[PDB]
Amino acid sequence: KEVVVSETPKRIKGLEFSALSAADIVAQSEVEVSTRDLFDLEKDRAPKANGALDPKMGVSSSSLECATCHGNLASCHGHFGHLKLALPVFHIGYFKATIQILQGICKNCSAILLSETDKRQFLHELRRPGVDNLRRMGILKKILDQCKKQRRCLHCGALNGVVKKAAALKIIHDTFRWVGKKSAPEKDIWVGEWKEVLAHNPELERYVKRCMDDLNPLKTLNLFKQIKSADCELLGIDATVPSGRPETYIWRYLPAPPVCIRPSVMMQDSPASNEDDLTVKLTEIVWTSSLIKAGLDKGISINNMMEHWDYLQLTVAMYINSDSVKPIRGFCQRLKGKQGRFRGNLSGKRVDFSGRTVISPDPNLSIDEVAVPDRVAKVLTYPEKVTRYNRHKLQELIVNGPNVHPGANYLLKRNEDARRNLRYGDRMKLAKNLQIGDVVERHLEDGDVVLFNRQPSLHRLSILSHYAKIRPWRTFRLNECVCTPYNADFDGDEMNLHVPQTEEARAEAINLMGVKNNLLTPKSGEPIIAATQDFITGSYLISHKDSFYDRATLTQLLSMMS
Amino acid sequence: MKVLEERNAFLSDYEVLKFLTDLEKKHLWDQKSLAALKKSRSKGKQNRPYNHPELQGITRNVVNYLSINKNFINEKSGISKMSDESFAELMTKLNSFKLFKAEKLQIVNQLPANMVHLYSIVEECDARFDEKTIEEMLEIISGYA
Amino acid sequence: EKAIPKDQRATTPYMTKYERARILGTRALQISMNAPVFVDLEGETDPLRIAMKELAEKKIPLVIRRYLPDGSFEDWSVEELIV
Amino acid sequence: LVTPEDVMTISSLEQRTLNPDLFLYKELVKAHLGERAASVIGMLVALGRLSVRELVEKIDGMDVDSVKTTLVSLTQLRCVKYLQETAISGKKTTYYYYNEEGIHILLYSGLIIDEIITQMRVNDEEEHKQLVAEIVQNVISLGSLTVEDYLSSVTSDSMKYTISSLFVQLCEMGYLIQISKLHYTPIEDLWQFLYEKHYKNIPRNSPLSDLKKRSQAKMNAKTDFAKIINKPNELSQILTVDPKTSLRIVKPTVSLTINLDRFMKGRRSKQLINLAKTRVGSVTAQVYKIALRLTEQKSPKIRDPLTQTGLLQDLEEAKSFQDEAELVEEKTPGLTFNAIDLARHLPAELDLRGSLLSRKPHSASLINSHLKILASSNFPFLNETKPGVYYVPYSKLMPVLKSSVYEYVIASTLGPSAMRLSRCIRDNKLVSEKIINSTALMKEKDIRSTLASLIRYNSVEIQEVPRTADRSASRAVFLFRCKETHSYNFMRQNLEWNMANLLFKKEKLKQENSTLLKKANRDDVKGRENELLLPSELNQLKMVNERELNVFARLSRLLSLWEVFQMA
Amino acid sequence: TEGRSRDGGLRLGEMERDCVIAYGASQLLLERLMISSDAFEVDVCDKCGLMGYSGWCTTCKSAENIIKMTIPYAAKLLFQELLSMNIAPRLRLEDIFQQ
Amino acid sequence: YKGEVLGITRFGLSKMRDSVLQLASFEKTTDHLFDAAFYMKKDAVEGVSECIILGQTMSIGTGSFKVVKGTNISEKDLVPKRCLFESLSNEAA
Amino acid sequence: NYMSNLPFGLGYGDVGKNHITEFPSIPLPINGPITNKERSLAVKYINFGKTVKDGPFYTGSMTNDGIERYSDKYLKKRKIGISIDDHPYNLNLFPNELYNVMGI
Amino acid sequence: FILSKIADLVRIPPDQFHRDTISAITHQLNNKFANKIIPNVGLCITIYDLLTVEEGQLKPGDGSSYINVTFRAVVFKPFLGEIVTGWISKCTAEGIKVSLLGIFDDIFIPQNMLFEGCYYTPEESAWIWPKLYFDVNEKIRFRIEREVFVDVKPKSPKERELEERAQEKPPAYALLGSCQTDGMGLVSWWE
Ligand SMILES: [Mg+2]
Ligand SMILES: [Zn+2]
Ligand SMILES: [Zn+2]
Ligand SMILES: [Zn+2]
């Protein structure tokens, strides 16, 4: 046995965006959610199988098991569940995509509105080695406009016109937009058909108006499933891989998100747990799907069925992006906004090992130093690994412990997985048994590299790297010479102090953002760390032409200077 | 990880013996490993923070299988005492004997002193030759015996 | 993928600030992982300070690989890069 | 409850997303030729036009020699179309299409040999039947078979003499047409090459303008395309030569390729005769079995004369193509026959005596009477331009035949109320929620349940009726439509996907029975499967062989369903 | 968390990120924005760029192509939310080494 | 530098970048994401915004080069050694 | 609350289960009893395709020991496959790019 | 015993920068291939030597030296005509469980390819012959004909959890034997 297992470090090279085909959605999903209910009175409000909060998709607490990975909240990555929708519905995110795709082809014979030898020149042009997003969009726009112009398809000429949406979220096509003073067998067929309608209705005379080629989601899906792979590239949808078929872009399967994606809060208002908007919306969607599924086997009023089917297209709209008339927080509401997903959590977030307090002046502090309260130095720590060079020092820090400042709060043993709180455990034994791979989270000490930042962070010198100097008061003190890059004025100003936790980050901070390395603004090269008001006035008064000093005064001045 | 090519140069079953012997003498000695050391390396993970598990066993099993007497019959360990010159004086017979086959590794470590043994080591042996060239090979591969 | 040989090298013979910061960080991380040092500590226990001393004595055993935009690269040992 | 792991392994959900045109063709090539050729043809379907370098940079196989070999095998299988496009400003390179119909020779192979055995007037002889079966199997396995190879291959000269004898018959019948450039280039590219020359042929400063010069150019292009397409579709120039003191011979240098068009004419005749066998009793259905057989040999094109696939049909004055199609159908005198012409071809078995009851021996009066009842039948089987001489029309038979076949497929799929509703939705144009009641008088509950069971397919089209300017289907009631074109579309995807599923099941069973099938298909094992075999292994081989016989039987039964919807 | 009452951390926003970028401190960017904020050890399948659990692809059901890497939990959450819609952001992976 | 004056607006940023994550982090996240998914865009991870979002080392500053450690291995200890049986079995032919 | 919406013809028991059949079931009538003709059609199907695979038209292939056993010396060769270039073909049906592989 | 050249990436920790890099790389390669079986290549005993040692490169976060190395390693690969002296340790009525001295012992030899007359019994009788036989834990001799590398392992984490709660192809490299030729099976049948 003991077969070789190989690990090789890897990095993300790129992202291939696409849509999940119904095969992929079930393949990833570990359970099907079919029941509209999340809890029953008979199970005493326990999450059971096939519900919206089914455990197999995750758990909403650290004291539960997934039954998929058997992990708590801290270990489960979240697992997906799938829904089966009878009578599929349109995709709100892909609505303009569907609009443009139905423009390219004809709704009669499911053939592209392009000549089999005309746009192939532009197609071969598309394989230009240098193609940008601009080139892609321009060529696709040219193709779309050309097939918009092309009325008659070369397989069946039925005068494709406009593929606009409803005046709603319905699609209407004008079959006879470009007809006038012209006679066709299609025209005779339509005229005879609508004569048979006008022959049995006392009122449809007004209502024959409009009533053009409506394109419901089911009709388009059945039309989409008729398209050959040959003209997928012209539609801009590479069909080399599965899920490149256009029909996968119609909502058929709903990938119900993992529990960790949509957490359920505990003990909110009522002693009972409070669910969230996404879970409520998917419960309602499952309910309506079950209702429509039932309506197939009984034969309910189709006009009444059209009401429920239309609500599906309305309920999934706000589920993805609440745009139709409104506090429903959709999936695109999570991602969009200042406090959304990207701008709030992806590039910009809250950090550990950071502090913030009022700032006070300190002239006796070196310009590349910041005075840090001992109270915040006893909680802010650096994870110093024990080597052959610092083992004695770290032993002394462990003996000191978490309650006297030159000490340590945590010990992470080399062969263990959980750090040891130094509040308890006879730290003398741990200090004796320190190894050469252990990590001691020791207090912030004199000379530690910290980041120091004032908001708003206008230029890069709004954050600089200082050496820590531990002091008894409760303020972040700094030399007034370095107030100008920070734009601080000791009048209640609060500044943020960050402790870099890794050696490489620490070295980068103190070597690229250090105060001494950043005395000049990068916008012009002029000095920006220099004398402030009282320093300038005192220098001027000393160097004033009326200033004469005897030997004693001069030597005292020099001693104060140093 | 990716294996460049599965079938490299062969090994004569004395070259592997001296390779494992050199392994043992260079490091992981078995007589010293039986001896106890209370202090050890003092570095924290063994002598000079290194250890040899799952390698001592595999370098001892093969050398033990070789150090057991070759099963030509039910005194020597069998491979211990042939020198480089001892195998380097056997060319005149080993390479003048014609077998059209790289089956040499079979007779250099097993099956001397029986005619059926070579009959199995080289197939269709008697039809290829059954007249007189069937006993001097025996005598010479048993020359170390 | 093709290394520009040591005899000709187009890029600057001076260590950049980024190269210095990265070399100090890498060497300090190695020291924090109990890598042997080649300088006299004189009581220094900080990996970053030991790495700074090593850089001062020009004894950091690392080489800078400067990839060109055309995909090639040339190697500059820390000692031969001047500050 | 079914496990997500359980489905998509026994449920075949990942196959339900496969496009049938790609899926079936890829599966056929994978089962017959190989995996690399299957990848090539699948990528050719995914991207219709591509060069060899496109294969190199779009498939895992990037070697030039290997892709050369697989592509030449595909071309030899008549599964690939090529064309050499010339860029005047530099080096030119050839592109590659895929032959849609060429793979039918692979698919229809068993049916092709079944009809080559059944059709022949002389089939009682066992040796003749077996040799014609073998010769058709060889020609379809090899693509273009040559008598230059075959005559040298055969060892007996008299056996060689029958070989040259069968071929002239096979070329007259249309089963063997001289392969040429026409079987490897796209229709629209042929049309563009014929369309650009006549635009460059015009001298400047003509009194005419663009409208009429384009009219004359497209007219001349249609004429020359018709000539170049009608020369090799039917021809005997290979067989015309006759050496001195010898029997008639075909050109031995040329390559003989088994054709498909007349074979599908025969299959269509078979399906029409099967319709008659179901429609009318065997006394005159046995007569009809041959009535089409004397017109099937020279029957016209089935869907498009290839002057409709290579060009846009028409925009203004669109009826021209249908008009000229029916015009040629009426003009062609050979297709028209009289009762005297049909009396010479009737077999001895049929009597035609008790077939008629005028009031409540190959007699030319009575066959003419069957012909009158055929033309007077509700379905337009025949038309009578002049007294006594009738002809088979297709200008109006195709829509009604398509409607009948699709409608009875829907009937076999759903329940009697459902076929009744479809019949109403069809005959009654633009039915509504009350017109259904007025024209049906059935139980609305089951009517609507079957309606819902029928909305899923492309069977009936729904409409939105806006009472206000904004369009909401919930606010006001809605009406129905026919839109039969989508229905005829659906019967392609579903049936093609089902055929692909059968091929997938067969290939997967082969994949899991590879070793058993290999130990089966060995020469000394063949004919001796009950001796050198273990008990349980022999039983396993037996049951899986019955299973694949079953899958081939189901495949054969399904193959009588898609060629009909493949017409126009 | 977000508040001094709940013992929340300080937000390194877009402007501070831009300042750190302008300094050219890539490792500090990594340490502040992943290591000290949200460092999740995800399992990524090399064949299809989809996230797994317990070293199991649970889409290819093989675990042969599953590799191990550290990404922001924000990135993990955004990928899973994208999979909630019909957007599959498949990760494409290459070796750091082998030059 | 693209040949035309492209502003610093949402439309201007769609110049040649193709970085859907960077574009989303700038503005109009969902429309760009859905366009990328529909067109099946294959944007690489090269932008500093994408590198930060994915937790990768950016290629600017201290990440604009690589640190390598010389193995200090000679060439006399790398040639194959102690091999004669293959030569014997070769000359034996 | 989206739960009061129910058509009068619809019930409450039917809804809520959902799930649907694992595979939609409508037994097709094209699986009828076999005939002698259909069995022979299956047989001829079997001989075909096998004919092309036993022929040289495969192009699908993607104990290999460096030492040759004495048994493999003077042992029957497996089969001399007829190469793709070996089979005579007509030049005019084939492209110029495809000429270099055939033995001309 | 046959060599085989393998290309691999070894990671030398900064702890081991002091020892000569040849020994460091060999040590890492040993800890990766000490007694391990290479998938569908054989069983690894140790590493013979080193050939291409590229300059070690550092990822921006580890500090260890990652070295692309090619090396020759000793793999035990009998092919068709190999003779071994195995030491049987287990006897079951499906083919005797021949074993080695702890090297690798999961190889099996079926009876049908073995001597025809040898049959197993429910009453635990050694062998029946038409004139000599053998007991367990004694010398043996056989051949190697075909190699089947068990390289399939589709194990789901929940199934593994159930297995662990309750608590097969153990090897990925096995051997098969034969005694069709007289004399094989024991080394002291005569003389
Ligand atoms: Mg202020
Ligand atoms: Zn879980
Ligand atoms: Zn059309
Ligand atoms: Zn995967």
Residue numbers in the entry:
A (entry chain A): 2 to 168, 175 to 332, 348 to 584
B (entry chain D): 1 to 74, 91 to 161
C (entry chain F): 71 to 153
D (entry chain O): 25 to 384, 447 to 654
E (entry chain B): 1051 to 1149
F (entry chain A): 1364 to 1456
G (entry chain Q): 14 to 75, 101 to 142
H (entry chain G): 2 to 131, 137 to 173, 189 to 212
Quote the study that presented this structure, word for word.
The yeast Ty1 retrotransposon integrates upstream of genes transcribed by RNA polymerase III (Pol III). Pol III transcribes short genes encoding for untranslated RNAs such as transfer RNAs (tRNA), the 5S ribosomal RNA (rRNA) and the U6 spliceosomal RNA.
Maps in the presence of IN1 reveal a piece of elongated density at a crevice on the surface of subunit AC40, located between a hairpin-loop (residues 108–130) and the C-terminal helix of this subunit. In the structures of Pol III bound to IN1, TD1 adopts an extended conformation that includes a helical turn along the AC40 crevice and forms an intricate network of interactions with this subunit. Importantly, K617 in IN1 appears as a central residue coordinating three salt bridges with D109, D111 and E312 in AC40. Our maps in the presence of IN1 showed no density for the rest of IN1, including functional domains for Ty1 integration that locate at the N-terminal half of the protein (NTD and CCD).
